[PDB]
Amino acid sequence: RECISIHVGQAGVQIGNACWELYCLEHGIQPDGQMPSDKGGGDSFNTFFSETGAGKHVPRAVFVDLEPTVIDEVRTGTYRQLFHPEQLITGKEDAANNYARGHYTIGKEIIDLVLDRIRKLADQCTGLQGFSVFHSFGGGTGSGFTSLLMERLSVDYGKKSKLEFSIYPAPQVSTAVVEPYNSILTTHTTLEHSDCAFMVDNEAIYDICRRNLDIERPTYTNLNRLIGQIVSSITASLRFDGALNVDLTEFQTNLVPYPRAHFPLATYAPVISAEKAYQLSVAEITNACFEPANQMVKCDPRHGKYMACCLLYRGDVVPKDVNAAIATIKTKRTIQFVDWCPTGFKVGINYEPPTVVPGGDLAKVQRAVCMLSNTTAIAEAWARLDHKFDLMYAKRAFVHWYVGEGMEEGEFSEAREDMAALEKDYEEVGVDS
Amino acid sequence: MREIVHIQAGQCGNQIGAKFWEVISDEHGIDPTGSYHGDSDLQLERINVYYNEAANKYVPRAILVDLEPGTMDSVRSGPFGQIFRPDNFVFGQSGAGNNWAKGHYTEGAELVDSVLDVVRKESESCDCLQGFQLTHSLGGGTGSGMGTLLISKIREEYPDRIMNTFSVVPSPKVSDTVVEPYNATLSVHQLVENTDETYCIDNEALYDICFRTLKLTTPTYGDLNHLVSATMSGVTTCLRFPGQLNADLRKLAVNMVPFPRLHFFMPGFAPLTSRGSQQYRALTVPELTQQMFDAKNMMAACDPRHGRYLTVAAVFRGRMSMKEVDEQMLNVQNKNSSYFVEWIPNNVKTAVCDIPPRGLKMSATFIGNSTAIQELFKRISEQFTAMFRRKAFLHWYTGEGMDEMEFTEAESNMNDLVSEYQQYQDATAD
Lengths: 433, 430
Ligand SMILES: Nc1nc2c(ncn2[C@@H]2O[C@H](COP(=O)(O)OP(=O)(O)OP(=O)(O)O)[C@@H](O)[C@H]2O)c(=O)[nH]1
Ligand SMILES: Nc1nc2c(ncn2[C@@H]2O[C@H](COP(=O)(O)OP(=O)(O)O)[C@@H](O)[C@H]2O)c(=O)[nH]1
Ligand SMILES: [Mg+2]
Ligand SMILES: [Mg+2]
Prior knowledge:
- The structure is cut from a larger assembly and holds chains A (433 residues) and B (430 residues).
- With 433 residues, chain A is α/β, with parallel strands linked by helices.
- Chain A folds into three domains: 1-264, Tubulin/FtsZ, GTPase domain (Rossmann fold); 265-377, CATH 3.30.1330.20; 378-433, Helix hairpin bin (Helix Hairpins, Orthogonal Bundle).
- Chain A has helices spanning 9-27, 68-74, 99-105, 107-123, 140-156, 179-190, 202-212, 220-239, 248-255, 282-287, 319-330, 379-393, 399-403, 410-429; strands at 2-8, 49-51, 57-59, 61-65, 88-90, 128-136, 161-168, 196-201, 265-269, 306-315, 346-350, 367-375.
- In chain B, the strands form two sheets. In chain B, strands 5-4-1-6-7-8-9-12-10-11 form a ten-stranded mixed sheet.
- In chain B, helix 8 packs across helix 9 and helix 12 (285-292) runs parallel beside helix 13.
- Chain B is of the alpha/beta class and 430 residues long.
- Chain B is globular and about 60 Å long.
- Chain B has 16 helices and twelve strands.
- The A-B interface holds A 1, 126-127, 246, 249-250, 253-254, 256-259, 308, 319-320, 323, 340-342, 344, 433 and B 93-95, 97-99, 172, 175-179, 217-218, 383, 386-387, 389-390, 392-393, 395-396.
- It is classed as cell cycle.
C-alpha cells in the first residue's frame, strides 16, 4: 500500500513541491492538510498520505538537503503546515556539485539522521510498498547523497522496491561543469540498488516548454510543473482506484527485462498552453506519444528497438477508442520490437481528468496519456554523458576535487567501465537471434 | 466419497469461483442469506457435497485465498458474498506481482500454513471427505504459484483424497503480463504430477467464443467468466445431483484417466448463450450432440480433428428422450470412429440429469480427454522458449530463490507431456 517519497537536493525538493502541490489539487487536500467530510467515498490515496487523529492528511514524504536554503522556503511558503517539521531535514554545508562531498565527506554526517526519520514513516505504515527517490544527476547532493541513501535502503529495507525520478542534466540550465562526472558516478553506485529509473532530460522539458507553451526561457517552475504532470500520471495508478486502472508495479514487470535495463522512456501528451481555444481525441494523443519531440529524454526510438510499451491513459478515454488507435499506429508507424518480446501494448485507464495548477501555464485537458516505453534508443543519453565524461577525464580535469573529498581516483575508472558495459548491454539486447 | 472441499486462489480463482457459487446456489435453491427457497427435493438430495449446515441455514464448503486483499472485498461486496464463512477468508496483504515464484516459494509459503488450518477445519466436519477442488489461473502469481503449493501441501496431508482443479490458461488475446508463459509452464509442471484431474479452461478459446460466436467486439472478464461458470456447473452436475454414472470424483477419474500424467480435460458445452436473458432456439437432441463435439464450443483452443479421444464424459441436462440420446451418442462414435481410441472399448459415457441450468430447458456438457490438448501445451511451450532462450525477465524468479534449472525441468516435462499425448495419438489396435 503505502509509498514513501524521498526528495534529495534542490532538484528533488523543488520538484516534490510541484508534485505534492499537484497531489493535493487532485485529491482535494488543502494546504493545512484538511479535507472536507466524505459524505466511505472511495478514499486509494492513503498510499501517499497518512491521517492524524485530528483529521489531518500529511504526505509520506521526506525532504533532504545539505543546505537549508531550499527547504527553508518550504517551511515558510503555502505548504508550511502540510509537512511535519521532522520530515524536512537540512544540513549547513552543501556538496558544491561534488559527488564525493555528498557521498563520502559531508553526506555521511547526516545519513544516520535521515534514515531515522525515514524509519519513523516506515513504522507509521501497515504495509510498505517501496520508495520514490527524487534527485538530480549533476548536483553534489542529488548524485552523491542519493547514491549513499540508496546503498543504505537496500541494507535496511532490502525487500522493498525503490524507484527514482532522476533529472538528466542539460547545458541550457546547467549550474556546474562537472555534472557529467556526477552523473556517471551516481548512475554507477545506484545501478544495482534501483528497481526502476525514470530519467528526465532537462533539455527535453526545456524545449517542450519553449515549443508547446511558447515560453522564451523557461524557469525551473515551468520545468517542474511539466515534470509534476508526468510524475502524477505515473503515480496515479497507486493513488487512485479504477476498474481498468492497472497498478504501476504491474507495468514494471513488463518494462524491466533485465536488472540493468531499468531505464524507461516517458512520453506525455498533450501539453497545451492556456492562451487560445483548442480537444484532442484518443488517436491524436496516442500518435503524439511516438513523436520524439514529446519525449522527456532526447533520443530517437526509430533508431532503436522496443522491449515494452505501456500507455497510461487518464481522462475521458474509452477502451475501444484505444485499441482502434493502437491498431492504426501499429500498422502506420515503425515500432521495432526485439524478436524475443510479445510485441503487445499494456494499457491502463484512469477516468479522472488531468489536473493542472490553477492560473498555471498548462491548460486543463479532457484526456491525456503518458507512454512508458523501454527502448534501446535511450542508450543515446548515456553516450552523450559518457562523451562529456571522457573529454575531461582523459585530462583528469576537476578530478582533484573528488579525490580531495575521500574518493579514490580509481572509482572514476570503475564507474566509466560500468557505463561502458551498460552501453554494450543495450547494444546486445537489441540484436535478434 | 461425499463432501467436496472447494478452494479458490488468486484474482481469477476468486472471480470464477464466486461466479460458480452464485450459479449452483441458485440451482440448489439457496438465496444469499443461505436459506433454501427451492421447490424440488433433488436439490437437497446431495446438497451435503458442497454445503454444510448451521443447525441457521446452508453454508458453502469453500475457502478463499489471495495474497492481495483487493479481491477479498469485491467478493464480499458481491451478491452472494455474505454467505461464505468469515473465517474461511485467508488473505495476505502483500501481493504476488504476477510472479509464480513469489506465490509458490516466497510470500505464498509464509501464508499457506494459515490456509491449511482452514482446510483442516472444514475437513473435520466431513463424514467422509471425497476430494478437493481448486479454481485458479496458471498465468498469474497467486493462483499459479500459491495454488500449486496448496495442491502439493494438500497432497502430502491428504494422500487419500482426489485433487481436482479448474485451471484457466493465459493467452496474448487477454493477457495481463509477459511472464504468463513462465508462470503457466511452471504451473503445468506441477499439475501433471500433483492433480488427479484438471479441466483446461483456455482464455484464448473463451475470447474467440465471445468474439466469433457471441459476436462481442470487446469481451470483458465478465463475458469470459460467464462461459466458465456455465462450464463448471455442467462438469459438476453428476456430483451434486443423484446420478449413477461418474457419481464421485474418483469414479470419474477412474473412467477418464487411462494414464496418470494424461489427466488434462478439454471441456465444452452447448448451447453457447450470451449474457442476455434467454434464447428461443430450444435445441433438439441431435443439435445438442452436434454442438457438443464441435470445436466452436470447446473451452480449449484445440481442434478435436487433430487428435483422438481417449475417454469422453457427456452430461445432458433437462427433460428429454434418453433413448434418443443413446442413438445420437452412438451415431457420432461410429460415424467418427477414427477420432476415438479403439484400444479402449466403451470409452464414451453419457449421463442424464432432469434438472436443467436456470435459463435453459436443454443443455449438454462435454468432457474429453483428447490428444489434441497437446496443441495447448505446444502453444504455451512456444511462448516460453521464445523468452527463455535469452533468459528475459528471469531475474524476478531467481531473485525469489528459484534456480535456473527449475525452468529447464518444467519446460522439459511439458514437452514430455506433449510427446506422450502424441504417443497414444499414434498407437493402434492391430
Ligand atoms: N527540473 C529542474 N531541475 C533542477 C532544479 N533545480 C536544480 N535542477 C538541476 O539540478 C542540477 C544540479 O543539481 P542540484 O539539485 O541543483 O544540486 P544539489 O542536489 O542541491 O547538490 P548541491 O547543491 O551540490 O549540494 C542542475 O543541472 C539543474 O539543471 C529544479 O528545480 N527543476
Ligand atoms: N477468465 C478469467 N481470467 C482471468 C480473470 N482474472 C485474471 N485472469 C487471468 O489470470 C492471469 C493473471 O493472473 P491473476 O489471477 O490476475 O493473478 P493472481 O491473483 O496472482 O493469480 C491472466 O492471464 C488473466 O488472463 C478472470 O476474472 N477471468
Ligand atoms: Mg543545493
Ligand atoms: Mg491480475
